[PDB]
Ligand binder design. Structure first.
Ligand SMILES: [Zn+2]
Ligand SMILES: [Zn+2]
Ligand SMILES: [Zn+2]
Ligand SMILES: [Zn+2]
Ligand SMILES: [Zn+2]
Ligand SMILES: [Zn+2]
Ligand SMILES: [Zn+2]
Ligand SMILES: [Zn+2]
Lengths: 264, 264, 264, 264
């Protein structure tokens, strides 16, 4: 009986279903797949990418950038929600092909640098090509590109380095406060007495409160279904989207129920 | 008028004054200099080093280990308070010469990896040879070597990755709770509205409360004068040592006064 | 039509077929699988591992070390032939579980650090958990553990960092010169005018001559079939093994034929 | 008697003497100091920097780029001769302030990543802020920016990763072959039987032959005096410059004399 073969990270088909750019605000565009968010922000001094999706999405992202008039060398910065394979997947290839820099907090930087391996909960089950962060970000630090200011808000739990990003765009010149909040799920995590993450419960509980207080007129999430976006229906995509409060409340109720189940 | 020459990091002579090993408890020894702490813990399965001091102290540390019967290959693990040049200085050389591993949190790992350069407050003024952390530690995580359990307690402020370490030794078989608490100083830091560390004040304030609640019968600090140790007087070294409460209280009063001065 | 799913690196079953330790010489043991070499060298000051095989072989290797009386903390050093997933696969996990250091040349170190990704020929098709090299080795440099001296011989081609290792063991006290020579295959490589490896042909040709001149009484290779070893037949495993000259000659004839085919 | 204080890397004043940009060819400019080369190549798609000089030269380089009409974000790529502090000094700061990428061979990448520490000959005596290489280059590989093609030629000896760069510029539309050849000095090196560089002599001897055969109408070197440039005399700076043959011949004669002295 030989040792088992390695298994690939397979995902639902809708995560891999390309879509054309969908405008979110004057400078902000969804350019990922129907079920994975990847936000392009276009400024007068270059573009910013927030998340990339799965590793095989690199070519799709570059195609959608080209549709927006963004050449590979116009991509200045890549920001991340968290460094799991389904959001940071293509970062290594994008850096090689664009010359962009990556900015991340220390926790995200170290997980990105090992390609998602030795994950606190998944081990080596979900890996991707490693990448190096070029700028280390602190909680509340402001990153500016072309006059648009992105503020980082640390929200540990789903990963130690999970981060929300806020910025103000316009909608026909009128200001709109966008919040790109990270996942608050704990998929199959051991929550209580986890030797690799002893303070996991306390971090999640603080993070629910962080998300509740974000300045936000429009909430988006790395998995669009988590904030009730439907990228497939085009102009009506944001009709049913949740507020920050409703997203945090829904996430905390699932968390408390999962914690009670684990206890029992 | 040419550009200025580079300047070396020069320190008080007492920081560089070697001393013979001083026993702290049954398994725990101070083996650094009169004014820089470096703790050796000897177990049945190898030795642990907490801090190393300045870069030029590598040979002294190895000599003092040899006096304790610890061969270079018996050093299993290096733990750190924080990754400034006067505590993590010799880590790169010690790893090369012993085969030890380094364990650190993500913040300390990334600062260690750039040799203290691009420091949030010191820039490139105080650098040292870079080293890589082999094990990333989470807050409250327990590291065990030879049955002795070290628990990490994150106390950000002096650096983002500043860490206290606690363990229980014996004194002639009777248990003694040791706390190696990091610095709580802010030497020349901009505290308020610092763009590189927006939440510095909140982190320090939480850290004062963390240090107050450490389980501790005997407090030690990377700079021994900060907890009123006097390594030079041998057996009487710990006579005047502060409690955790007194150390945190004294540190917070200096912090509040410095913050009021900066305001004015 | 969605993007393709990621594909796992699947290998022949015999590569994953565990075997008990097979003695090669007084201090040297094959402890990998029937079709992947992993050599354990036991000295008076600890053990050395040369190669590890596939990522999922970490537990098997630790089990076979335990059968030899080698505890996890007795493993001092890991050396590599080359940093493809089928030889460096488990290195990251072995370092975490043993405290060993890894020594490698600069080329191997950088490929190991990206987990085999962005391979000059395979792209991201064959990746594994990244690891960091602790000691960088130069051509002809001698690494000594417990009195046993390993000499590195660079033989670029299969990877830029491909390395042969030589050492002298005994067979009942009588000296035997062992050569662990790396692969000389070019599986599906573009050899001529390769933009990522412009001097590939010149490097292979020099490497054939390097292997021919190795001091060698007993040749072993990362893939045992390449030097006509048969690990499955126990005591007769080395009966048909090739000399260094015959291995290099056979490899060069395959290389020249492949190069003529590519031309045509 | 305390341990010695750390010593700073001090250099001759002329190495730190700023100068205004000096045109070398239609697209190529010397923008470093009177005694340290730093070449700016301006293309239609951004600028390339070859070497930076000492760590404290970062601000000067950015000022001289601005005089040439090159904004910080127009700097696309940094190439290096070798990763000693007097040529790679400011690379870390330049990357942070420009968003440029660094391309280097594996040897140079690993020395750059440790900030020049653990140098084969200098130990930790001459360090600088570490930086990460973003693109790894192979011997003979071509790097293209804005249509201008740079070819790497490995010339190990002064460091293992020492590299010459060649490209074709114009002088009023007429082609001129430029060679930026690395140092061939061995300042205070142990050449024979060096345990850290066993094949040093063979590498130098091959490198002399590599430099002799470079395609070259105009030779430049990281230290301008080595190829008889005089940056201080402006238009006459290149009057007495050596050919590639004369530079290699002069370097080999010094090398042979130094080797005979070491023997005696
Ligand atoms: Zn996730
Ligand atoms: Zn996800
Ligand atoms: Zn400090
Ligand atoms: Zn200090
Ligand atoms: Zn291979
Ligand atoms: Zn193989
Ligand atoms: Zn040099
Ligand atoms: Zn130089």
């Amino acid at each position: 009986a030989p040792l088992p073969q390695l298994r690939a990270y397979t995902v639902d088909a809708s995560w891999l279903q390309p879509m054309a750019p969908l405008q979110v605000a004057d400078h902000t565009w969804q350019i990922g797949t129907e079920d994975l968010t990847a936000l392009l922000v276009q400024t007068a001094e270059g573009a910013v990418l927030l998340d990339g999706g799965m590793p095989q999405m690199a070519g799709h992202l570059l195609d959608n950038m080209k549709l927006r008039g963004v050449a590979p060398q116009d991509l200045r910065l890549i920001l991340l929600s968290h460094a799991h394979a389904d959001h940071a997947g293509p970062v290594a290839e994008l850096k090689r092909r664009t010359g962009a820099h990556v900015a991340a907090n220390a926790e995200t930087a170290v997980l990105l640098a090992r390609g998602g391996s030795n994950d606190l909960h998944f081990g080596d089950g979900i890996t991707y090509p490693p990448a190096s962060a070029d700028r280390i970000i602190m909680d509340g630090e402001v990153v500016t590109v072309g006059g648009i200011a992105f503020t980082a808000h640390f929200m540990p739990g789903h990963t130690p380095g999970s981060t929300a990003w806020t910025w103000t765009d316009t909608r026909d010149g009128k200001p709109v406060r966008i919040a790109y909040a990270d996942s608050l799920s704990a998929p199959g995590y051991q929550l209580k007495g986890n030797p690799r993450y002893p303070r996991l419960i306390e971090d999640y509980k603080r993070s629910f409160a962080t998300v509740r207080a974000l300045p936000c007129d429009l909430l988006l999430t790395p998995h669009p279904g988590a904030s009730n976006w439907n990228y497939a229906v085009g102009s009506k995509a944001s009709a049913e989207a949740l507020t920050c409060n409703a997203y945090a409340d829904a996430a905390e109720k699932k968390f408390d129920a999962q914690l009670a189940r684990e206890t029992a």
